[PDB]
């Protein structure tokens, strides 16, 4: 499963996966309704679920 970032998430804590709009992210785990774990361009971390939409 892959998702696409719609909004810029600026990371603030170690383990956060920063996102720029258009970035496609491999979804590794849905931790809760509010936080996902994923990978993008070689980086792995967590990000809020409402920054992204389905891609494939």
E strand or H helix at 33: none
E strand or H helix at 51: none
β-partners of residue 43 are 40
- Domain residue limits, the chain: 1-56
Nearest C-alpha neighbor of 23 from the set 37, 39, 4: 4
Q: How many residues would you count in the chain?
A: 56
Q: By what method was this entry solved?
A: X-ray
Q: Copy the structure tokens of residue 27.
A: 């979804």
Nearest C-alpha neighbor of 5 from the set 36, 51, 54: 51
Written as one string, the DSSP assignment of 8-21 is -B---STTB--B-T
CA gap 12, 14 in Å, rounded: 7
According to CATH, the superfamily of the domain at 1-56 is SH3 Domains (2.30.30.40)
Q: Are 7 and 51 contacting, i.e. CB atoms less than 8 angstroms apart?
A: yes
């Amino acid at each position: 499963e892959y998702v696409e970032a719609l909004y810029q998430f600026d990371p603030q804590q170690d383990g956060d996966l920063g996102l720029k709009p258009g970035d496609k992210v491999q979804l590794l785990e849905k931790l809760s309704p509010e936080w996902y774990k994923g990978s993008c361009n070689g980086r792995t971390g967590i990000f809020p679920a409402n920054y992204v939409k389905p891609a494939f």
